[PDB]
Write a protein that binds this ligand. Structure first.
Ligand code: ADP
Ligand code: ADP
Ligand code: ADP
Ligand code: ADP
Ligand code: CL
Ligand code: CL
Ligand code: CL
Ligand code: CL
Ligand code: CL
Ligand code: MG
Ligand code: MG
Ligand code: ZN
Ligand code: ZN
Ligand code: ZN
Ligand code: ZN
Lengths: 626, 626
C-alpha cells in the first residue's frame, strides 16, 4: 500500500558546506546517531539540510533552501538544540514552560485573598502582576528581585506567594504541590504535579521556576525544552538533537539515553548528533561523516548499524573503544588560590585551595555547584582569563578572520600586491556589496553579490591566483599553507592561523559568520585569540563540547603546553578523558542543589580512583578499567 | 513495536460548540470524509478540535520570539502536523505568480536566459528590483504589468516576463516546454512540472499575473493544493473544506484522484464533504448529526462507505438522491438583454436572460460565468447581488448585530429591569474591558470575563428567566420562540429570526462571531437581510456551497417561493439538483479560458438533456438517468 510505503527519509545529492554530494537513508520512527570528527559535516547534514528543508516546506504553507537534489520522506522537524528558549530580560524557566502558566492558574484559583485571573500573577503584563518600579525585570528594592507587585505577592496558598513558589527547587515545588488538598483544583494539581515530576525525572529538579532563561547552560536549555516534547501528544515528527549528553555527569548519561528512546517510542524520528560512545551504542542506525574535517571530510564513510560501525575502520569506528589512562605522575603546585566562605547559590560556605601551575579539573553532577564555585570565587580575580561558550558581540558582522585580527595583514598583502589601498578589501569599501559585506543576509546567501562580498571591481585583484572572496571561503587549514610562501606570504596571518589550527579549528572558513559557530567553537576561537600571553589563570567551562575523542587528545596537548609554559589551567568538565589527565580534581556534591554545594573530594586522580568514594570517583575508576 | 504503533488519531471527549462528548478513531495515512448536514458539527470536530490542537502543539515548540487555546476535548492522541487547505484567500502586491513556486522559478529562468542581462531573479520582481517606480508595483508607464522598462526589456524569444505572466498557465507550460538551452535543462523541467500540475488540477486558465484577491475560494484552495502535491512532506494531516467547491460535474473525478494522490504520498487526508461522488472514495467516514445545532453534534455513523450507505442516517438516506427535471417550467415575463459582453474571456456575447423564472448559469470553471453575470447583469437597477464575500468589521459583529435585532432586545432588557438599553451594549462601562464579544484577537475565549461579555452585576438583569449573556448563546431557532410570546416578547427580533430560519440558519447563535461563518453562511445571512427589501432580480453565486443534499432540498423550496412571489432568480451553479430544478439554463463553454467564453447552450433543462451536446448536458443527462 503506497500510503504506508514512505518509511525512510531519503537524501540524495546533498552539498551544503563541505558535504560531497552525499546520500543517506534514515529509518523513520527510529533513533539515528550522526557521528564523525568535529567539522566533518554532521550538522551540515542534520541541521542545514534535513531540518532546514522540513522547516522551509512548513514555512511555505503559512499565510503570514539548502543545496540538495532530492529529499524524500521528510516530516516536520523540531529542533531540540542548545540555544536559549527566550533571551529577553523577562524570560524564566517558568515563562518558557507549561509549569509557570499552570502555577499562575493554580494561584488565581486558590490563593487568598483573591486578586484576579492568572494574569494578576504574571510579571510580563501590567494594569496585571508586574512590579511597576522595575517593570517585571527585577533589577530592584521594591520587589527584591521577584519581579512582582505587592498585590501579586499578597495572595498566598498556605503561606506561600507565587514568588516563594517560583524561588524553590522544582523538586521542592513538586513536593509542595503533592501536599495540597483542595477539591476545587484536583485536576490542575495532578497536571502541574506531573509536569514538575517530569522535570525531576530528566534531572532538572535543582532548577527553580524563577531562573532567568539566559543563565541556563546550553544543556539545561535543551533539557528544559525536552520536558515539553516528552509531554506532547505530537507524533510522526522528527526531533533533532545537538549533543544531548552536554552538561551531563557520567552517572546521568543512561537516564538521557532512556529519554531519547522514550521520545522515539512515542512514534517519532529521533536524530542525534553525538560523540559519546555510551549514547552512540543505543542507536538503531548510524551515519558517520568523515574521513576527517572540512575539505577532508563531508563524506558518509559509514552507514548502518552500531555493530557495522565498530567493524568499519573509520576514524570513529577505530576510536569507539578508546578510554584514557591516568597520568603516571602529576605536576606539583607553584602556589595556591585560597577560596574562603564560598556561598553563591547552593554553596555550603566552601573553603578550598586551588593549586596554581597545574591542570585542575572541577567535577560533580549537574547542579552540584561547579560553576557557582569557580565563577563566584576565582573568575573575578586579577590575571584570570575566563574563556566560555557565550555569544561573541557583533557576530552578524564578523567572522574568524576579523575576530582574530588576521584580516588586516591579509588586506595589506592584497593592497601591496595590486597597487591599491588596504581599505578597498574591507566592510567599508567602495567596492563592498551594498546589501551585506558578510555575503549572507536566518542567515542566507546574499543575492546581490552571490556570496562574493565585493563587487567585481575588487575581485579582479588577486594574490597567489586567488581573490579576496576565495580567501574568505578558505578553511584555516588551507589558508595556513596559502599564506606561508610565494606572493601571498603573510607572516602575521600565519601566526593566528597556526593558533586556530592548534585549538582544533582548522576546518573553519576565514569568512564563516560567527553566528554559525557552536558554543564549543566559539570557546575555542576565543581560546585561540587569547593565546599569545596576557594573563596566567585560564578558566574553561566544558571545553570538550562538540569534540570527538580524536579531537580531545589535541585539546589535552594544547592544555599541557599552556600549563608547562607557566600558566594555571582550571577546567570544569564531565569528560572523563580530561579528568584522567588532570594533576588535581575538585569534586562537587554529593548531588545537585541542596543535596550538593560541598567539596566531596579534593586530590589527585589516582587517589580519586583508589577511593571510588564519590559518584565521580566511581565512574572514573570504571572508565580507566580499574 | 511501540514506535510503529501510533497509527490512529484518537479523539475522546470532544465538546467544542455543539459536539456531544464525541469520540472517533481516524486512521492515519488514509482519506477520512466528514459528512452531515450544515451545523451538525463537522468543522467543530475537524477544524476547531483536530487541526487546531495539532497547530497549538507545533506553535508551542517555536521560540518565544516566533510565538491558540486548547480546544475543549479530553484526549487527543496520535496527532501529526496539520495543514489547512481551506477556501480562505491568499491576499495587494500578491498574484498567483508571487504566491507560488512558479513565479519564483519564472524569474530565475528570465535572469539566466533573457537578453539583455539585467540582473538576478529579483530584477524581474515587482516587490527596488523590477518594480515600476511610477505605480510602485500595483498605469501609463508600464501598461498594468507592474514592471519597469528595464524589467520588460529582457527577452526570451521575443517575450518579456510580463508577457509570460499574462498568458494562461496552460500556454505558458507549452512555451516553457519549447525552450531548449543546455544552460537551464533542469530549471525548465522543474518549472514545466509545477505548471503541468496547475494544468492537471484544472487551473490552466489562470494567468500568473492574476491578482490573488480576485480568486474564488475554490481557486484559492486549488492554488494551495499545487504546493502540497509538489511538497516532499510526509506524515502530515492535510485538512480540506469541501474541495469540490467551484467544480463542474465533469471535473470531480480529477479532484478525487488528486486527494487520493496526496494520501498515497504518505499523508492523512481529512475532507469535509457533501458530494456523494467524493464521499464514496473514502477509506473511512465520520457522519455528524442527527441534524443541526442542538439536534446535532453527535457521531451518528463511523465506518466504511458501504456502512454509511446502509446506515439510515440523514446522510446515508440521501446518498443516492438524484433530482429529476420538472414536468414543466415557468414562462418568462420579460428579458434582460445582454449585448456585447466582453469582460475577460467573453466573446462579445449576446444573450437574453429570462425575467420571472429561475435561471441557472452553468459551464466549467473558467468558462466565463461570473465574467458574464457580474460584468453584464450585476450593475443594473433592482438587481441584488448576494455573494459569499466577507462582511465589514466581522471581528466586532454577530448575527444579532448585523441584522439590527440586538437594539430591540436591549430595550426589552432595559424596560423590564428599570435600567437603560446602553448597560447591555458594547459601549457600556459594565461590558468586559478587553472584549464585549467574549473572544479576543484567530478567535479565542476572553480571560478577563471568561466568555461572559459583561460583569456579573449586568447579568443580574433578566427577562424570561434569561440574562443577556444567555441570549447571545441561544440558537436562532430557540431565540425565535423566546422572543415570540411572554415577558421577553420582542416582535422586531422575531421577524428577523424567522428569516434566518428560512435560509437554513436556525442553528446559528445570536452572539456567534461573524468571522466564524463560512462563505455559504455569510451568503445565506445576507440573503435573509435582503428578502424584506426592494429588489426584483437576485443573483446567487453557488448558493449550494456548504449544503448537504438535505439542506439543498430546503434551499430549492426557498428559491421557488422567491420566484413564485414575482422575483427573478439567477443562480450560478455546478450542483446538478439545482440545474434539474431550473426554468432555464445558460451554459458557457465549450471549455475554460480562451476555449470558453461563448454561450454554448440556452434552453430548458429538458432541452439541454435531450440535446446532450455540451459537457453540462452530457453530465446532466447522466445525472437524471437519461
Ligand atoms: N553556515 C556555514 N557557513 C559556511 N561554512 C560552514 C557553515 N557551517 C559549517 N561550515 C563549515 O562546513 C564544514 C562542516 O561543518 P559542520 O557540518 O558544522 O561540522 P560538524 O557538525 O560535523 O562539526 C566545516 O568546514 C565548517 O567550518
Ligand atoms: N543564576 C542563578 N540563579 C539562581 N540559582 C542558580 C543560578 N545558577 C545556578 N543556580 C543554582 O545553583 C545550584 C548549583 O548550580 P551550578 O553552579 O550552575 O551547578 P554546576 O555548574 O555544577 O552544574 C543549582 O541548584 C542551580 O539551580
Ligand atoms: N466559533 C463558534 N462559536 C459559537 N458557535 C459556533 C462556532 N462555530 C460553530 N458554531 C455553532 O456550532 C454548531 C456546529 O457548527 P459547525 O461545526 O460549524 O457545523 P458544520 O461544520 O457541520 O456546518 C452550529 O450550531 C454553529 O452555529
Ligand atoms: N479578475 C480577473 N482578471 C483577469 N482574468 C480573469 C479575472 N477573473 C476571471 N478571469 C479570467 O476570465 C476567464 C473566465 O473566468 P470566470 O468568469 O471567473 O469563469 P467562471 O466564473 O465560469 O469560473 C478565465 O480564463 C479567468 O482566468
Ligand atoms: Cl566555571
Ligand atoms: Cl581585522
Ligand atoms: Cl456519479
Ligand atoms: Cl432523512
Ligand atoms: Cl443603566
Ligand atoms: Mg555546524
Ligand atoms: Mg464551523
Ligand atoms: Zn521590582
Ligand atoms: Zn552581498
Ligand atoms: Zn507602472
Ligand atoms: Zn471579555
Amino acid at each position: 500500500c503506497a500510503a504506508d510505503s514512505h518509511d525512510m527519509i531519503r537524501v540524495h545529492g546533498a552539498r551544503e558546506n563541505n558535504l560531497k554530494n552525499v546520500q543517506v537513508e534514515i529509518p523513520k520512527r527510529r533513533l539515528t546517531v550522526f557521528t564523525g570528527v568535529s567539522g566533518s559535516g554532521k550538522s551540515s547534514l542534520v541541521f542545514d539540510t534535513i531540518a532546514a528543508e522540513s522547516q522551509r516546506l512548513i514555512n511555505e504553507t503559512y499565510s503570514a533552501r539548502p543545496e540538495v537534489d532530492v529529499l524524500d520522506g521528510l516530516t516536520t522537524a523540531i529542533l531540540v538544540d542548545q540555544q536559549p528558549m527566550g533571551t529577553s530580560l523577562r524570560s524564566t524557566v517558568g515563562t518558557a514552560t507549561d509549569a509557570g502558566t499552570l502555577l499562575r492558574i493554580l494561584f488565581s484559583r486558590l490563593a487568598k485573598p483573591y486578586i484576579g485571573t492568572q494574569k494578576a500573577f504574571a510579571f510580563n503584563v501590567a494594569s496585571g502582576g508586574m512590579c511597576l518600579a522595575c517593570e517585571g525585570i527585577g533589577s530592584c528594592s521594591e520587589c527584591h528581585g521577584t519581579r512582582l507587585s505587592e498585590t501579586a505577592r499578597s495572595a498566598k496558598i498556605d503561606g506561600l506567594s507565587i514568588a516563594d513558589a517560583s524561588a524553590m527547587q522544582i523538586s521542592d515545588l513538586a513536593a509542595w504541590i503533592r501536599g495540597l488538598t483542595d477539591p476545587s483544583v484536583t485536576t490542575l494539581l495532578t497536571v502541574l504535579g506531573q509536569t514538575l515530576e517530569s522535570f525531576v525525572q530528566i534531572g532538572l529538579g535543582y532548577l527553580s521556576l524563577d531562573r532567568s532563561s539566559s543563565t541556563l547552560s546550553g544543556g539545561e536549555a535543551q533539557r528544559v525544552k525536552m520536558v515539553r516534547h516528552l509531554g506532547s501528544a505530537l507524533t510522526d515528527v522528527t526531533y533533532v538533537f545537538d549533543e544531548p549528553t552536554v552538561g551531563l555527569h557520567p552517572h546521568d548519561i543512561q537516564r538521557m539515553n532512556e529519554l531519547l528512546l522514550r521520545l522515539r517510542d512515542k512514534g517519532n524520528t529521533v536524530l542525534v548528533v553525538e560523540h559519546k560512545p555510551e549514547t552512540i551504542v543505543i542507536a538503531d542506525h548510524v551515519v558517520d561523516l568523515g574521513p576527517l574535517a572540512g575539505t577532508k571530510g563531508g563524506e558518509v564513510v559509514f552507514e548502518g548499524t552500531v555493530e557495522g560501525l565498530r567493524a568499519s575502520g573509520t576514524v570513529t569506528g577505530r576510536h569507539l573503544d578508546d578510554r584514557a589512562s591516568l597520568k603516571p605522575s602529576v605536576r606539583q603546585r607553584t602556589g595556591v588560590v585560597e577560596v574562603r566562605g564560598a556561598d553563591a547559590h547552593n554553596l555550603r560556605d566552601v573553603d578550598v585551595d586551588i593549586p596554581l601551575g597545574v591542570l585542575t579539573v572541577v567535577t560533580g553532577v549537574a547542579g552540584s555547584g561547579k560553576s557557582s564555585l569557580i565563577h563566584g570565587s576565582v573568575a573575578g580575580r586579577d590575571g584570570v582569563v575566563t574563556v566560555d561558550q557565550s555569544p561573541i558581540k557583533g557576530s552578524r558582522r564578523s567572522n574568524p578572520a576579523t575576530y582574530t585580527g588576521m584580516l588586516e595583514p591579509i588586506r595589506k598583502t592584497f593592497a601591496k600586491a595590486n597597487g591599491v589601498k588596504p581599505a578597498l578589501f574591507s566592510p567599508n569599501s567602495e567596492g563592498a556589496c551594498p546589501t551585506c559585506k558578510g555575503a549572507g543576509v536566518v542567515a542566507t546567501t546574499c543575492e546581490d553579490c552571490g556570496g562574493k562580498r565585493f563587487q567585481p571591481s575588487v575581485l579582479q585583484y588577486r594574490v597567489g591566483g586567488r581573490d579576496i572572496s576565495e580567501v574568505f571561503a578558505m578553511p584555516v587549514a588551507e589558508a595556513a599553507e596559502f599564506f606561508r610562501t610565494g606572493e601571498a606570504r603573510t607572516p602575521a596571518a600565519c601566526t593566528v592561523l597556526d593558533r586556530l589550527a592548534e585549538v582544533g579549528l582548522g576546518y573553519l572558513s576565514l569568512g564563516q559568520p560567527l553566528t554559525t559557530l557552536s558554543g564549543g567553537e566559539r570557546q575555542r576561537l576565543k581560546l585561540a585569540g587569547h593565546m599569545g600571553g596576557a594573563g596566567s589563570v585560564y578558566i574553561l567551562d566544558e571545553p570538550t563540547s562538540g569534540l570527538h575523542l580524536a579531537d580531545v587528545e589535541q585539546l589535552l596537548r594544547l592544555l599541557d603546553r599552556l600549563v608547562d609554559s607557566g600558566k594555571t589551567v582550571i577546567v570544569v568538565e564531565h569528560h572523563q578523558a580530561v579528568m584522567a589527565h588532570a594533576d588535581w580534581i575538585i569534586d562537587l556534591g554529593p548531588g545537585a542543589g541542596h543535596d550538593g554545594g560541598r567539596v566531596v573530594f579534593e586530590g589527585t586522580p589516582a587517589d580519586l580512583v583508589a577511593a571510588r568514594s564519590t559518584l565521580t570517583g566511581e565512574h572514573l575508576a570504571q572508565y580507566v578499567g580499574a
